[PDB]
mmCIF file of C-alpha atoms and ligand atoms in Angstrom:
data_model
loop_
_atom_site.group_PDB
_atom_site.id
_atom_site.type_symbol
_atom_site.label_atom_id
_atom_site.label_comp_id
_atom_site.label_asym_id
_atom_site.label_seq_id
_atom_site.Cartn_x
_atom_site.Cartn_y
_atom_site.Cartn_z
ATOM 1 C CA UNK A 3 9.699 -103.839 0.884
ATOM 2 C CA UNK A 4 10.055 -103.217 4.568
ATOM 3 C CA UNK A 5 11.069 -100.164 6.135
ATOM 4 C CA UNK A 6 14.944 -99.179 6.829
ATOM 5 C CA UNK A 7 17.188 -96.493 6.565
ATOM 6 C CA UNK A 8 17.776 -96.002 2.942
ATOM 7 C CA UNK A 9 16.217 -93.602 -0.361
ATOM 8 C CA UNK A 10 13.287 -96.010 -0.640
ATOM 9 C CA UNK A 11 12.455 -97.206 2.768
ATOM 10 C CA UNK A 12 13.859 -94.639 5.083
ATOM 11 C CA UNK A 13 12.406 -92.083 7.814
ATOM 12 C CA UNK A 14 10.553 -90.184 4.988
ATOM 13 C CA UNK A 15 8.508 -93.285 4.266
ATOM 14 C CA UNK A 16 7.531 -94.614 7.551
ATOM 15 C CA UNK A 17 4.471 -92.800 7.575
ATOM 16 C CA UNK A 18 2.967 -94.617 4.484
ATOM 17 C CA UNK A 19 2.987 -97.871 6.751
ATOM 18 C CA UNK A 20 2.697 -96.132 10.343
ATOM 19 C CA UNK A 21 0.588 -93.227 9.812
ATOM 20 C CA UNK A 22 1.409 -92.165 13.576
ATOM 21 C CA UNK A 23 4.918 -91.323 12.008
ATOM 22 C CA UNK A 24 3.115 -87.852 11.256
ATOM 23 C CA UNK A 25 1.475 -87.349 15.270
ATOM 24 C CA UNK A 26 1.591 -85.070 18.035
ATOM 25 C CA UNK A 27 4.651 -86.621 20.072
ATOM 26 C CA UNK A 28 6.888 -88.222 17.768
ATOM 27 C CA UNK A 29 10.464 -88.640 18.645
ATOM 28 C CA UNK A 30 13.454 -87.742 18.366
ATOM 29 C CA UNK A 31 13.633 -83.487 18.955
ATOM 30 C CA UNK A 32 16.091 -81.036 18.414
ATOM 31 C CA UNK A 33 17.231 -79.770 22.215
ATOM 32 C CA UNK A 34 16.709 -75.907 22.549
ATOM 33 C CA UNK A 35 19.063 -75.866 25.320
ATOM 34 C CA UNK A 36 18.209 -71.834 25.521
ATOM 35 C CA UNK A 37 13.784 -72.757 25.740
ATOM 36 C CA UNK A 38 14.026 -75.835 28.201
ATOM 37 C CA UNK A 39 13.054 -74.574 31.331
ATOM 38 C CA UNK A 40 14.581 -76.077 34.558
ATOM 39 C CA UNK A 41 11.870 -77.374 36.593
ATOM 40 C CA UNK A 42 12.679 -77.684 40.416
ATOM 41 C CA UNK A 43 9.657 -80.184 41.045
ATOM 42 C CA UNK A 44 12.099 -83.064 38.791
ATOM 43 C CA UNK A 45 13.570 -85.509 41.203
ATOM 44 C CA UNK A 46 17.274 -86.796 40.809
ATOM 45 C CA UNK A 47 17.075 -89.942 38.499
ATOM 46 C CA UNK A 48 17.106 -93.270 40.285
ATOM 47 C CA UNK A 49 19.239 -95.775 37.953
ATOM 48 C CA UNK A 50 19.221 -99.160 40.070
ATOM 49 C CA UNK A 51 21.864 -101.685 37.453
ATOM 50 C CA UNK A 52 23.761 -103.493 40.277
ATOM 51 C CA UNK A 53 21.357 -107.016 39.675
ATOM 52 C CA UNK A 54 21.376 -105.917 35.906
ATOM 53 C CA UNK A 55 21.728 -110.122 34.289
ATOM 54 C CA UNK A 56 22.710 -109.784 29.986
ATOM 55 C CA UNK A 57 21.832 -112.670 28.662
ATOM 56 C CA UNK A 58 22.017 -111.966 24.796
ATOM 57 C CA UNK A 59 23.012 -110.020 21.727
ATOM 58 C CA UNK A 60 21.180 -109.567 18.413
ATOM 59 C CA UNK A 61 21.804 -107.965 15.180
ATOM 60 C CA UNK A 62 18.502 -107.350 13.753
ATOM 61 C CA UNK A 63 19.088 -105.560 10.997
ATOM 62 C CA UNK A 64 18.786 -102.145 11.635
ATOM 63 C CA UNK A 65 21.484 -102.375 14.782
ATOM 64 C CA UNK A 66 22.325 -104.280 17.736
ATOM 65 C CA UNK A 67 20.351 -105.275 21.021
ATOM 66 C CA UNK A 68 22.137 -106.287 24.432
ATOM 67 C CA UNK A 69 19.269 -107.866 26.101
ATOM 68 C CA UNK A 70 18.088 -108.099 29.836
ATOM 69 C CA UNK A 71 16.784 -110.941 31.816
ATOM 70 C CA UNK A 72 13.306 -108.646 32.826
ATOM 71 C CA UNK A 73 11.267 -111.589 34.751
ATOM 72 C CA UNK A 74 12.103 -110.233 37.782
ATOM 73 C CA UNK A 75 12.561 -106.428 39.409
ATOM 74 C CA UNK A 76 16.314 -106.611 39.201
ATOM 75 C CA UNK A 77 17.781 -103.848 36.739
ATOM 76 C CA UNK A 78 15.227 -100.465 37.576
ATOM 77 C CA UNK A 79 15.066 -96.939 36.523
ATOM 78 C CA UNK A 80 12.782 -94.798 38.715
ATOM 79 C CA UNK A 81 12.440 -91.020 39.869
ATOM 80 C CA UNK A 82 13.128 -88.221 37.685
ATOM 81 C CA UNK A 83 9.797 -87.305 35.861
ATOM 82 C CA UNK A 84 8.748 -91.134 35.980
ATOM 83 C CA UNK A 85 5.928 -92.694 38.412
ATOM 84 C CA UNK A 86 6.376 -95.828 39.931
ATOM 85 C CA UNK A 87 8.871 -98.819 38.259
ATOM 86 C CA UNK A 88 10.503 -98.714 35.286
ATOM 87 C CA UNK A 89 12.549 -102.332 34.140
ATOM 88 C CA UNK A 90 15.938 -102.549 31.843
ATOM 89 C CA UNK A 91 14.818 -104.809 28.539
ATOM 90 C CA UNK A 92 17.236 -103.679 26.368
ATOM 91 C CA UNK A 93 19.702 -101.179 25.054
ATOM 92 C CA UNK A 94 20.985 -100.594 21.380
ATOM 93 C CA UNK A 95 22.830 -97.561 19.678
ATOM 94 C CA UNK A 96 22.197 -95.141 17.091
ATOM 95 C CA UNK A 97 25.423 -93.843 14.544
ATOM 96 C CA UNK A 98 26.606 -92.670 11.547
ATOM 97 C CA UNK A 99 28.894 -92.752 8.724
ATOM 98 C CA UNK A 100 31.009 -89.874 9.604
ATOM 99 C CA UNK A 101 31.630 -88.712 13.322
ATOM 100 C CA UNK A 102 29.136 -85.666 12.645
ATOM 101 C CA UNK A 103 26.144 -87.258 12.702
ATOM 102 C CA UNK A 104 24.407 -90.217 14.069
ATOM 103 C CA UNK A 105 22.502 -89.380 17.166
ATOM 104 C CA UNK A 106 18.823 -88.881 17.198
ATOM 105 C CA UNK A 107 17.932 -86.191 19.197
ATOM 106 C CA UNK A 108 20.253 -82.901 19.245
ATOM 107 C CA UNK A 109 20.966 -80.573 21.427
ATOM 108 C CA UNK A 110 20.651 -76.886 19.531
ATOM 109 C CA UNK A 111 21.039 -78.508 16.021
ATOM 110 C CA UNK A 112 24.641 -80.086 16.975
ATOM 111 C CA UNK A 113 24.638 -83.680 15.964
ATOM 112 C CA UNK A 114 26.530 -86.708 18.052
ATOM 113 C CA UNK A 115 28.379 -89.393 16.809
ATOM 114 C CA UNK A 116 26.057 -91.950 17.761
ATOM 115 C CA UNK A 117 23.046 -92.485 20.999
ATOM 116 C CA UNK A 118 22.625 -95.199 23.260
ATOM 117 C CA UNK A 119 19.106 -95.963 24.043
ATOM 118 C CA UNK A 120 18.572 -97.976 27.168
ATOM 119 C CA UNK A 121 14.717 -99.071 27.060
ATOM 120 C CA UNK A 122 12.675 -99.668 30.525
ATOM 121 C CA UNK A 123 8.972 -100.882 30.591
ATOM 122 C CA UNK A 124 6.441 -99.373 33.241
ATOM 123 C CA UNK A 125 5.795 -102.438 35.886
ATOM 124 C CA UNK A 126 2.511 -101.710 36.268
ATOM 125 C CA UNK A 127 1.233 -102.814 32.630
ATOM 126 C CA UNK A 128 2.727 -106.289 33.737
ATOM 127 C CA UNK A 129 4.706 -106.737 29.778
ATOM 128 C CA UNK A 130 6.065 -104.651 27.431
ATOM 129 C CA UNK A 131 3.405 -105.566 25.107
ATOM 130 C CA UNK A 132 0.630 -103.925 27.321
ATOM 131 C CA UNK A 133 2.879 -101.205 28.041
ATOM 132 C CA UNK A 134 3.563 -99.635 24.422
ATOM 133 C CA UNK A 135 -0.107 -99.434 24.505
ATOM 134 C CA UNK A 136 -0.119 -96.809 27.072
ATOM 135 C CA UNK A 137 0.884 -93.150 27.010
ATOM 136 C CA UNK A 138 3.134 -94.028 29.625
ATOM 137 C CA UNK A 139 3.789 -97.047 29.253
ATOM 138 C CA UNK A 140 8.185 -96.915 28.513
ATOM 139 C CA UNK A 141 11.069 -94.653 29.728
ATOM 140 C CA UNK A 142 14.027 -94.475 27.288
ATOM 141 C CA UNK A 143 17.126 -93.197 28.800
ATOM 142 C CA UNK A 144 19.173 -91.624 25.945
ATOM 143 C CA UNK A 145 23.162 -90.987 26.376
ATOM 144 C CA UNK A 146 25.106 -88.939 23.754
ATOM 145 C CA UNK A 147 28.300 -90.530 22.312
ATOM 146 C CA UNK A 148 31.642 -88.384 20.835
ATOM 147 C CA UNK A 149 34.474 -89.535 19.772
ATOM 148 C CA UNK A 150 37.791 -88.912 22.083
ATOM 149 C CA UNK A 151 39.206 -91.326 24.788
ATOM 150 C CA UNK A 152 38.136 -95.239 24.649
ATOM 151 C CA UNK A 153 34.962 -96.111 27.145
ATOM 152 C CA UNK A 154 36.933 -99.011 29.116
ATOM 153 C CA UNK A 155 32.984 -100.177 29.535
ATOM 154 C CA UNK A 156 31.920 -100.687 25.633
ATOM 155 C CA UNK A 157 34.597 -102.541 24.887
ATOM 156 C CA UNK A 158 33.295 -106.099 25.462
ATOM 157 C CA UNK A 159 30.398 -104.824 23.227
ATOM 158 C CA UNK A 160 32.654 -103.970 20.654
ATOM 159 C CA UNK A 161 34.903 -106.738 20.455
ATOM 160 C CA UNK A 162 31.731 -109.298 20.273
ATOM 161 C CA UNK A 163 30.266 -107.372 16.923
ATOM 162 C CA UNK A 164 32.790 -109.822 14.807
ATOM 163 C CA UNK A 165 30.571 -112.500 16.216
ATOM 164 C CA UNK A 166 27.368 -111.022 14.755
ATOM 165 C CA UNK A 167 28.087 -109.263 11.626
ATOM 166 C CA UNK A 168 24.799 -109.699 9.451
ATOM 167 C CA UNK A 169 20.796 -109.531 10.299
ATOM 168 C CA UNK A 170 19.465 -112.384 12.332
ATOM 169 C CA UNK A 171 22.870 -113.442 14.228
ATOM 170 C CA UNK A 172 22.852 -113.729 17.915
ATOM 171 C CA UNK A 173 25.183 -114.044 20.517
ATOM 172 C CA UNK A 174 25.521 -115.541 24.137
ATOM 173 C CA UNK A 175 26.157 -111.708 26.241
ATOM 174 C CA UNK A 176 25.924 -112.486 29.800
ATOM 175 C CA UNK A 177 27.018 -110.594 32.785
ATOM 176 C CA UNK A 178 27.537 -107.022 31.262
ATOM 177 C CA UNK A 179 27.127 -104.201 33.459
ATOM 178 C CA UNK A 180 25.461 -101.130 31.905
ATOM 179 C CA UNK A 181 26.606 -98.939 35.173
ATOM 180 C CA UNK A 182 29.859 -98.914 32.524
ATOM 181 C CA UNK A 183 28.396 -97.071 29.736
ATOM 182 C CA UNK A 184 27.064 -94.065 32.101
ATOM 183 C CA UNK A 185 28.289 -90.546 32.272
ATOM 184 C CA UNK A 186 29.472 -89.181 35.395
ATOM 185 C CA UNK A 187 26.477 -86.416 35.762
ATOM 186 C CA UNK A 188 22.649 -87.671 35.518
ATOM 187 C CA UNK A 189 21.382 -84.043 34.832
ATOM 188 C CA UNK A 190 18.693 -84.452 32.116
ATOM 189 C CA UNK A 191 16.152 -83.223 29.898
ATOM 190 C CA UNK A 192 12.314 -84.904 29.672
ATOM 191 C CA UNK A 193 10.116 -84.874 27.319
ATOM 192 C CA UNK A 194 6.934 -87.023 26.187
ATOM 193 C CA UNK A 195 7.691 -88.425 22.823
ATOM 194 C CA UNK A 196 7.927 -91.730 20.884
ATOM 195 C CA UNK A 197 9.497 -95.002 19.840
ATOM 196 C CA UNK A 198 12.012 -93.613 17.064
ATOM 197 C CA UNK A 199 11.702 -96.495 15.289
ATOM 198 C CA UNK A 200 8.380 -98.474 13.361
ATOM 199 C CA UNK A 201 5.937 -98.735 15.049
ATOM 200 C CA UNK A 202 6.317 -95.266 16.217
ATOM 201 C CA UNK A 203 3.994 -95.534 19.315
ATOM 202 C CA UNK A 204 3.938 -92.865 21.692
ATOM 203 C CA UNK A 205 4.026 -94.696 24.342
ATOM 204 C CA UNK A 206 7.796 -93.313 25.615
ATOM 205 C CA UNK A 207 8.813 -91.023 28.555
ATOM 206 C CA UNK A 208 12.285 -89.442 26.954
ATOM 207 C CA UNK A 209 15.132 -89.027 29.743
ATOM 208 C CA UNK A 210 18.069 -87.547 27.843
ATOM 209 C CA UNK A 211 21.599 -87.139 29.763
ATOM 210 C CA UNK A 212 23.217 -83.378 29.359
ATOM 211 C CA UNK A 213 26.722 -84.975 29.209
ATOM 212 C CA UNK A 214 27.932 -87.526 26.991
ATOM 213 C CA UNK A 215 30.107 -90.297 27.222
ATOM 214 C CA UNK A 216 33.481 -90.353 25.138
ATOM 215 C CA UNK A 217 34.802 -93.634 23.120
ATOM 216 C CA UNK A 218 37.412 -93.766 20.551
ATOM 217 C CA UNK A 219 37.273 -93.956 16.726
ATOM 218 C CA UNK A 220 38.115 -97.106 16.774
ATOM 219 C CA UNK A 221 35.310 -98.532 18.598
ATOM 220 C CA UNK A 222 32.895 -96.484 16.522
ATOM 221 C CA UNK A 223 34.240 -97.572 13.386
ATOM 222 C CA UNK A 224 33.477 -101.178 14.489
ATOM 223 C CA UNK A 225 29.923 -100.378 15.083
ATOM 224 C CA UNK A 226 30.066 -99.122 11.250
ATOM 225 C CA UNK A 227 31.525 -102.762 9.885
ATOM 226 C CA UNK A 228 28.473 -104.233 10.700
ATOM 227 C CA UNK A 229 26.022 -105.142 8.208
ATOM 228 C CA UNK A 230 22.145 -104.612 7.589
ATOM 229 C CA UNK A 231 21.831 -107.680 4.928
ATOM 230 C CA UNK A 232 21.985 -111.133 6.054
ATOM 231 C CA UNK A 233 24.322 -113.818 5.493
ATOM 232 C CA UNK A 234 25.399 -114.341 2.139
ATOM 233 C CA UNK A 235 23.663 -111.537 0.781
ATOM 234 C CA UNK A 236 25.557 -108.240 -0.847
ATOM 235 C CA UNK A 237 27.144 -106.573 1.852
ATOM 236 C CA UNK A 238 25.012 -102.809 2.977
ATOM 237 C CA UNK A 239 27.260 -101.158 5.883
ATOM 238 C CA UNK A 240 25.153 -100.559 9.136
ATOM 239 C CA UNK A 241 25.171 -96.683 9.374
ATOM 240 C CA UNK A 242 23.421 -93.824 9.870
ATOM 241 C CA UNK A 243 20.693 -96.021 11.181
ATOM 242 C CA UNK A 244 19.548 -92.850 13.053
ATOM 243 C CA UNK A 245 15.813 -91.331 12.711
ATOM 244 C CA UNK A 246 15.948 -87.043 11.907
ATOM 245 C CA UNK A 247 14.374 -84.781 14.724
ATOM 246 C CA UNK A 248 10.585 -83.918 14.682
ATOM 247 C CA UNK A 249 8.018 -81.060 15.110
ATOM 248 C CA UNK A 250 7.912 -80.583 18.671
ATOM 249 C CA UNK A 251 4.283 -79.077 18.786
ATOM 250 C CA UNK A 252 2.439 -78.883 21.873
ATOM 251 C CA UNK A 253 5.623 -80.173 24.042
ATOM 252 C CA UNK A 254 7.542 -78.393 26.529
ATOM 253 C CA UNK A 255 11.405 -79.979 27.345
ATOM 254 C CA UNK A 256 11.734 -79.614 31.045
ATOM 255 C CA UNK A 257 15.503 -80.140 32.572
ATOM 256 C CA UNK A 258 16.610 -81.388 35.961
ATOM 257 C CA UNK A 259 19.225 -78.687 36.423
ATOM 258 C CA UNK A 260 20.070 -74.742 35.918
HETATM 259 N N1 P8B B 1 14.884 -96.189 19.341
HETATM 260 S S1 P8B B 1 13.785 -96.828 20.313
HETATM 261 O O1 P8B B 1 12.522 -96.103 20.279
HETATM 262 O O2 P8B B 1 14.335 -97.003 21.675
HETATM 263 C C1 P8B B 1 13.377 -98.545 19.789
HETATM 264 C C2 P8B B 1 12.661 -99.393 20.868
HETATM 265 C C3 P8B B 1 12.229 -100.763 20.318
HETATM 266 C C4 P8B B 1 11.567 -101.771 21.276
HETATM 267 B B1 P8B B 1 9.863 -101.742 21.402
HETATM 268 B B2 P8B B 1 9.451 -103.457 21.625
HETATM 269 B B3 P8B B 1 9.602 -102.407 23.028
HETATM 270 B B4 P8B B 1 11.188 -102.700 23.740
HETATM 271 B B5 P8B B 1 12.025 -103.997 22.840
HETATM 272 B B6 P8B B 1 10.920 -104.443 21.511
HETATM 273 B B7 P8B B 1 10.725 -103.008 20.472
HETATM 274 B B8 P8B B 1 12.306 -103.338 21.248
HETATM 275 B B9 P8B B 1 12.475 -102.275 22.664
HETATM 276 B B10 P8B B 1 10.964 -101.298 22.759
HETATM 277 C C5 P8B B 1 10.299 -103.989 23.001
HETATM 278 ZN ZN1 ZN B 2 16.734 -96.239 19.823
#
């Protein structure tokens, strides 16, 4: 009885097995576009993805990982609100059901059709082990999706979901460029939150993009014929594989622009 996204094992349980599900910085928020005050001390994001090297995709049952070749300083965030070095691992998405919901955070209670999540690890905790144990340990960069025009740049993700339908299928993924799945604008909002998913560790320095990225219905609706269950086993549609907004408490949302 592991945890998930359904009635029995969903968001409203984690905290029976993760107790930090209940904490001080627990991710995602809801955006208050109107009480997140521009700070002019925020530096323009630094998103360094020319050396980026894919080497893999994995359904693992609760949605999709493109995954990054991290043994050397090649694919880097830095700047913004983040000290020092910041390396690509891995990005996944968020979505839903319908095209009104799916994203994690919000931005003034409006929901997105789905959230990419592109997860860096601080250099100078030397893994990503050693790094979720530290308050500062990860920076997530977080880029809304809605439904309009195709994204030329998803769609060798998309067409290689066929090849990895059910939990625990993997996939050769090489030479993907992530540059392809970025807005034009990096304006942003930062926050200090959490892993949205078990084990909930607040270990994450949020960096969510202002303007989303557009792909068709028809590339969303292939991230919905995916499956949660494994081979062989009764088919459970991957969606709404999302995580509801939390108390903010004690944190202020600061944004990189007026
Ligand atoms: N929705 S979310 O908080 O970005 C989920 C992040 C999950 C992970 B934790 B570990 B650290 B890196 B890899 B593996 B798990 B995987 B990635 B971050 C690693
Ligand atoms: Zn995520």
């Amino acid at each position: 009885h592991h945890w998930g996204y359904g009635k029995h094992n969903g968001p409203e349980h984690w905290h029976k097995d993760f107790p930090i599900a209940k904490g001080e910085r627990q991710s995602p928020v809801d955006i208050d576009t109107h009480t997140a005050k521009y700070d002019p001390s925020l530096k323009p994001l630094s998103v360094s993805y020319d050396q980026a090297t894919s080497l893999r995709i994995l359904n693992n049952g609760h949605a999709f990982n493109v995954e990054f070749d991290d043994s050397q300083d090649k694919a880097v965030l830095k700047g913004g609100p983040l000290d020092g070095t910041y390396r690509l691992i891995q990005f996944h998405f968020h979505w839903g059901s319908l095209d009104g919901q799916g994203s994690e955070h919000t931005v003034d209670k409006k929901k997105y059709a789905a959230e990419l999540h592109l997860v860096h690890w601080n250099t100078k905790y030397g893994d990503f082990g050693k790094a979720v144990q530290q308050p500062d340990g990860l920076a997530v960069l977080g880029i809304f999706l809605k439904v309009g025009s195709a994204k030329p740049g998803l769609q060798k993700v998309v067409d290689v979901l066929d090849s990895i339908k059910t939990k625990g299928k993997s996939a050769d993924f090489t030479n993907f460029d992530p540059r392809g799945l970025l807005p034009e604008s990096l304006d942003y909002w930062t926050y200090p939150g959490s892993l949205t998913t078990p084990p909930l560790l607040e270990c994450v320095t949020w960096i969510v993009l202002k303007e989303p990225i557009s792909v068709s219905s028809e590339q969303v609706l292939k991230f919905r014929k995916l499956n949660f269950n494994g081979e062989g086993e009764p088919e459970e549609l991957m969606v709404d594989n999302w995580r509801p907004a939390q108390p903010l408490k004690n944190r202020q949302i600061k944004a990189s622009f007026k």
